[PDB]
Design a protein around this ligand. Structure first.
Ligand code: DF6
Ligand code: CL
Length: 303
């Protein structure tokens, strides 16, 4: 409710930066973008969600060159926990340095309104929408290639002991050189993804054990990766067109028609009932790199 008739809920106010966590603030301060150095084009919305939004922005570097960016914004800055989670969603990238992981250009704090997390524009948007878009004509090799890229990102993130928790094609970005940036929209979650979040959790991407404990690990990320592979080879079909009960009947996602057998064997390993028996992202990189190398771009996958 944006325009309530009356306040009913008690008002917990966070002021009249200092109210935030010191370490978070320090981290945000050293990736600061000056309010005047960023132009946000609020008329040019890239994507809307119920908690946040993403706009086209332009950033001027010190040399005067215009940089095209995406500017993520919080719809409401009255809840301190939401504001903190929002800045954390941006600042976590400051400690990642990998070509298959989304980077942070900076965070613009202005005198009024939402902080603004600035990201490099990703020409082709989210991987799911890209592969679903009929206009594109990816081959099996292209599609496996994207999976390989996601695997490399996750290998790096796993090496840094980072648990993704929401690995899915919708959360991977694709830049102009068709480089896949593992990511997470977080509070800018698109309003049309709500069906995939059932806490609101992404149940169709979640490991058997996470569905029951709601605990997430790198091994549960491996499960999600398998589903992500499935998404790729079906060119973005929704998985499993209660999921715990379904799975526990003894089922897995069916092999997609354009999914090669060795790659399905890999998805099945990613869905091993026992988490500890699931492949590492390192092994997935190895395995998928091999499978990838066998193709030559002659199998075109239909939407
Ligand atoms: C061309 O279209 C788009 C183009 C778009 N280019 C750019 C950005 C976009 O949105 C994002 C995407 C992602 C984030 N991510 C943030 S703030 N944090 C994280 O992703 C943290 C993180 C990092 C690695 C692993 C897990 C978690 C913000 C905004 C874009 C969205 C677009 O359309 C929906
Ligand atoms: Cl191919």
């Amino acid at each position: 409710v944006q325009y309530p008739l009356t306040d009913m809920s008690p008002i917990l106010t966070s002021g009249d930066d200092l109210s935030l966590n010191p370490e978070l603030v320090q981290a945000v301060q050293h990736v600061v973008i000056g309010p005047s150095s960023l132009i946000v084009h609020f008329n040019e919305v890239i994507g809307r969600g119920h908690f946040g939004c993403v706009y086209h922005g332009t950033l001027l570097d010190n040399d005067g060159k215009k940089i095209h960016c995406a500017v993520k914004s919080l719809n409401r800055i009255t809840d301190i926990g939401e504001v903190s989670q929002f800045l954390t969603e941006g600042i976590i990238m400051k400690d990642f340095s990998h070509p298959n992981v989304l980077s942070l250009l900076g965070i613009c704090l202005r005198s009024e309104g939402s902080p603004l997390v600035v990201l490099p524009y990703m020409k082709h948007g989210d991987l799911r929408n890209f592969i679903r878009n009929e206009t594109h004509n990816p081959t099996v090799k292209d599609l496996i290639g994207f999976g390989l890229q996601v695997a490399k990102g996750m290998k790096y993130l796993a090496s840094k002991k980072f648990v993704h928790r929401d690995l899915a094609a919708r959360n991977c970005m694709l830049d102009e050189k068709f480089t896949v940036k593992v990511a997470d929209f977080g509070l800018a979650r698109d309003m049309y993804d709500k069906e995939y979040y059932s806490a609101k959790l992404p149940v169709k991407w979640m490991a058997l054990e996470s569905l029951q404990t709601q605990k997430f690990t790198t091994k549960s990320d491996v499960w999600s990766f398998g589903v992500l592979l499935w998404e790729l080879m079906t060119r973005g079909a929704p998985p499993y067109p209660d999921i715990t009960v379904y799975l526990l009947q003894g089922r897995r996602l069916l092999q997609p028609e354009y999914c090669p057998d060795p790659l399905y064997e890999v998805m099945l390993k990613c869905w091993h009932p026992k988490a500890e028996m699931r492949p590492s992202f390192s092994e997935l990189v190895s395995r998928i790199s091999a499978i990838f190398s066998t193709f030559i771009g002659e199998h075109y996958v239909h939407v």
